[model samples]
Target chain A: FVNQHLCGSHLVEALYLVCGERGXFYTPKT
Target chain B: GIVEQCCTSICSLYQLENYCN
Candidate 1:
């Protein structure tokens, strides 16, 4: 299995918190 | 919206500060 370093959703949320909507770190939701 | 882990084991201190307060 892939070593899951973090929840992809949570990472997206964290980016949202720190970087705001304007931030660019796009990852398509699985 | 502006909202929000181990990677949470090593968190940004600033983020935690903002989160808790």
Candidate 2:
């Protein structure tokens, strides 16, 4: 078996952060 | 870790829930 999976969890957390809190800063100008 | 959130639990059961077979 392999040692461990680092990038997988990192990518998932990055995706979650981007999809979660990053949305609070970007909005369409009215 | 103990000083961050005292009243809440950050434990997640969704870790690697999408892993393959």
Candidate 3:
């Protein structure tokens, strides 16, 4: 939960894991 | 047991629908 909690949603993380990829960073509109 | 099965089912379907790339 902590890994992807800041980067994206559960689905995003799942696909990241499912696709065997990681290290994606997201920048909010702030 | 049924709850766990449903959980796995959801995960399996989610994987099939979004994963497998």
Clashing pairs in 1: B5-B8, B6-B9
Top candidate (lDDT) = 1
**Number of the predicted model whose TM-score against the real structure is largest:** 1
Top-down DockQ ranking: 3, 1, 2
lDDT of 1 by residue, B1-21 (tens): 224443544456365334334
Ranking by TM-score: 1, 3, 2
Better of 2 and 3 by TM-score: 3
TM-score of each: 0.29, 0.23, 0.29
User: Which residue pairs show backbone clashes in model 3?
Assistant: none
Docking class of 3: incorrect
Tell me the spans in candidate 2 whose CA falls farther than 4 Å from its real position: A1-6, A20-30, B1-21
Worst ten-residue run, lDDT, model 2 chain A?
A19-28
Tell me the deviation in Å of residue B18 in model 2: 19
**Candidate 2 C-alpha lDDT tens digits along A1-27:** 123333423434423443333411123
lDDT of 3 at A8: 24
TM-score of 2: 0.23
Q: For model 1, how big is the CA root-mean-square deviation?
A: 10.4
- Candidate 1 vs candidate 2: which has greater DockQ? 1
Worst window of 10 by summed lDDT in candidate 3 chain A = A1-10
